[PDB]
């Protein structure tokens, strides 16, 4: 329940074979795969680079299956801009 | 040091001493001198209790007197041609053995005329009527029958109209003022675990909590903190109209301007509050917007249909009215809550080191439990729109029905013009004309209606014995219209006010009300009002046809039913 | 293409984080987001610039959402059943 970006870093290292499969594997593997990873990745890296981003709720998240995986809870986020 | 005598109400005179630099509210309340309820508020300008009369001598070299303070003053009994308020004067080297000097100020009550009506019948029909919206017309009828005062058959309570009155009526103040509590609203504080706010408290809560709110919210130092930003708000709501305005042929509009003029004084006073800006003027009306003002209006329409019944009365016959007045309560807690919320959660993680609005101060503070700061928030974002929005079409309605006065407000506001672009904070001196205009809007239409006060001691008004435990009501609406204290009362003639000023005639302006309880948003209704109508007179003129007098709708506030077409042409 | 739109979503929560008093916005963020990927996807796909950063949501974007939100919670209830039963 620790969340520790560097460990998929560290997984590479010594190589363990799939451990990040949320899109599938193979040729049915998610199409939109890295048409997702574009729009994800681009929208926080500009937003780290002008906002401070922080929450009093640090409470988990209830998550509720309607199919997909969700949120039940969306969480009161503040963007602080920094100026240097 | 420097030694002051000080004669006090008993006739004794009081010798003690103080440093210079220091105010004689100072003095009086580092020495403990028995100068009973001196200083009540501390030194925010928000009572008259440091009333103090002063030698000629002394009296003529002191500073000039500020309109917050003679404001003050107008609201003090026993006003004098030498009297000043002890808060504002620091001591000086020629007050060497000065000598002030504190102010000192029948038939039974059931002799006094009766309103013939019967509380019942009058209850039943707003069963019906869902509403009692003539009510202030029945009153005037009332006064004008039965002379300055009467008594309604109920308990006891006696109406009055008259300064004489008011005067006595603070006198008796107590430190812990009774205004009569509202039922419907308490009764929804109760049920859902909130506490009550200034507005519907009253004894050491009231008090605790009043001395913590003076200082953000009404303090000239407070006012001078977010007054910079009220400008910014008018500012943008004037260039915001000029550009609309000279797209057309004419260099005009003309239109409805309730709407644009109601969603003004929610983006200043979410600014002022909550350091937010809203992004309501300018641009559309959102859906958190209306939802609120309905709720408001809801809101108050569901007060008067449910006040005048006891909770055991209105339970079975209106609980429709009920669950209509909570889920308005509803709606606007959950606005309120969450400007709060959001700014709870910044406070948090950084504490600003320059001013970022009123509420930010308090929770900075930390005076005050949250569950307090909250019911006061709640309060303050909920009591800003209506009460300020109403009196602020009705001046710009009385411009367009009055060319001359309004000629003569623009010349004071383009005169004053850079003055204030430099630097905000003068409107409130430079603006003297403007402010005498929002007297005479508030004295014909005081959205205030009555002022309230369960009094604490055997008094006595106009030769009628008043027994403690009463109720006694200001109608502020029949007291504007006295042609005796007002010549020719209907002619809006705001230079009235600066006639009255000299001379020491005493409480003429009060629908703010008067002691500590007087209205906690008094000065920032006062700074949304004055400077979007200084914005406005300096780039438009503002017309109309519609010169038939606005008939008024009593829904617990005193407003307008009719909204008039007005026109404001830009000048080039 | 995508860039475009991080970019325009970024300087319009900046625009609007500048103007308060604080330098900050909180808000629930998840509106915002959801018109991000309609206007990243839509225009990565279809080259077409919808509008929908920055600017309030339209009539058709609120109506699509409802429209998936529908559509999976109508799935569970029927993907459990053959149709010889849902029907
Ligand atoms: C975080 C984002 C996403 C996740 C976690 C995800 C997950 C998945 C998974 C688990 C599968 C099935 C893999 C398998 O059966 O082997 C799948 C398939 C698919 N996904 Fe996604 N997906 C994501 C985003 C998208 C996007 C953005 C699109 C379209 C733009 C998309 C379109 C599809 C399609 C068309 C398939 C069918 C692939 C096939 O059957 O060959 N997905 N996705
Ligand atoms: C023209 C505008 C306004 C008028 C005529 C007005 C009138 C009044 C009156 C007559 C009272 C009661 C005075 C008394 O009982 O002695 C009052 C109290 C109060 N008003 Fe207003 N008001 C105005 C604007 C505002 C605004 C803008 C706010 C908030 C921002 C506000 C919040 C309050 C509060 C909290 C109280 C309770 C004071 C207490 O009980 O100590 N009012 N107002
Ligand atoms: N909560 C609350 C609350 C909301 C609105 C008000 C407004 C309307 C009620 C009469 C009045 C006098 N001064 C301000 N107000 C007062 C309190
Ligand atoms: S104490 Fe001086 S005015 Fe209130």
């Not at chain 2, 435990?469 to 009362?489: C, E, H, I, K, M």
């Not at chain 2, 008939?551 to 009719?562: A, D, E, H, N, Q």
Request: proline share 5%; with cysteine; charged share 20%.
């Amino acid at each position: 329940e620790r969340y520790n970006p560097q460990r998929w870093l560290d997984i590479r290292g010594s190589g363990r074979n799939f451990h990040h499969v949320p899109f599938g594997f193979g040729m049915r593997q998610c199409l939109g795969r890295r048409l997702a990873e574009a729009e994800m990745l681009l929208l926080l890296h500009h937003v780290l680079k002008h906002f401070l981003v922080e929450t009093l709720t640090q409470e988990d998240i209830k998550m509720v299956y309607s199919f997909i995986l969700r949120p039940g809870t969306s969480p009161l986020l503040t963007f602080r801009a920094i100026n240097h | 040091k420097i030694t002051v005598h000080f004669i006090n109400r008993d006739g004794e005179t009081l010798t003690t001493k103080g440093k210079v630099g220091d105010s004689l509210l100072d003095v009086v309340v580092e020495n403990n001198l028995d100068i009973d309820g001196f200083g009540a508020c501390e030194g925010t300008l928000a009572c008259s209790t440091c009333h103090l009369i002063f030698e000629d001598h002394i009296y003529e070299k002191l500073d000039a007197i500020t309109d917050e303070e003679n404001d003050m003053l107008d609201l003090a009994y026993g006003l004098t041609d030498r009297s000043r308020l002890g808060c504002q004067i620091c001591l000086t080297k020629s007050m060497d053995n000065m000598t002030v000097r504190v102010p000192e100020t029948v038939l039974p009550f059931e002799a006094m005329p009766q309103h013939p009506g019967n509380r019942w019948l009058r209850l039943l029909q707003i069963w019906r009527e869902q509403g009692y919206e003539h009510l202030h017309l029945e009153m005037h009828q009332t006064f004008q029958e039965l002379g300055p005062i009467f008594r309604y058959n109920l308990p006891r309570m006696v109406c009055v109209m008259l300064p004489e009155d008011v005067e006595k009526l603070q006198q008796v103040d107590s430190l812990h003022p009774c205004r009569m509590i509202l039922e419907p609203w308490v009764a929804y504080r109760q049920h859902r675990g909130h506490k009550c706010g200034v507005f519907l408290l009253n004894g050491p809560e009231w008090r605790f909590n009043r001395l913590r709110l003076n200082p953000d919210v009404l303090s000239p130092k407070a006012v001078q903190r977010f007054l910079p930003m009220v400008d910014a708000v008018a500012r943008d709501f004037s260039q915001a109209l000029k550009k609309k305005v000279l797209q057309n042929a004419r260099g005009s509009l003309t239109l409805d301007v309730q709407p644009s003029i109601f969603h003004y004084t929610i983006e200043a006073s979410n600014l002022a509050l909550f350091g937010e800006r809203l992004g309501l003027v300018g641009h559309s009306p959102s859906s958190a917007s209306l939802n609120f003002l309905h709720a408001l209006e809801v809101m108050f329409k569901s007060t008067v249909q449910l006040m005048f019944m006891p909770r055991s009365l209105s339970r079975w016959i209106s609980p429709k009215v009920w669950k209509e007045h909570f889920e308005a309560w509803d709606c606007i807690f959950q606005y309120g809550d969450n400007c709060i919320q959001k700014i709870y959660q910044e406070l948090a993680f950084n504490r600003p080191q320059h001013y970022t609005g009123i509420v930010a101060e308090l929770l900075l503070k930390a005076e005050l439990s949250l569950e307090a700061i909250k019911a006061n928030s709640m309060e303050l974002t909920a009591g800003s729109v209506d009460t300020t929005a109403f009196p602020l079409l009705m001046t710009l309605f009385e411009l367009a029905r009055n060319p001359d006065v309004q000629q003569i407000l623009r010349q004071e506001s383009l005169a004053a013009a850079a003055s204030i672009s430099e630097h905000p904070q003068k409107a409130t001196t430079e603006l003297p004309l403007l402010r005498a205009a929002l007297k005479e809007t508030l004295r014909l239409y005081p959205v205030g209606l009555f002022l309230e006060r369960v009094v604490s001691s055997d008094l006595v008004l106009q030769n009628y014995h008043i027994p403690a435990g009463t109720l006694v009501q200001v109608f502020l609406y029949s007291l504007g219209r006295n042609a005796a204290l007002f010549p020719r009362p209907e002619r809006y003639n705001p230079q009235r006010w600066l006639d009255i000023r000299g001379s020491g005639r005493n409480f003429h302006h009060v629908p703010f009300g008067f002691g500590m309880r007087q209205c906690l948003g008094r000065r920032l209704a006062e700074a949304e009002m004055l400077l979007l109508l200084h914005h406005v007179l300096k780039h438009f003129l503002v017309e109309t046809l519609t010169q038939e007098d606005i008939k008024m709708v009593y829904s617990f506030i005193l407003r307008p039913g009719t909204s008039p077409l007005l026109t404001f042409r830009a000048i080039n």
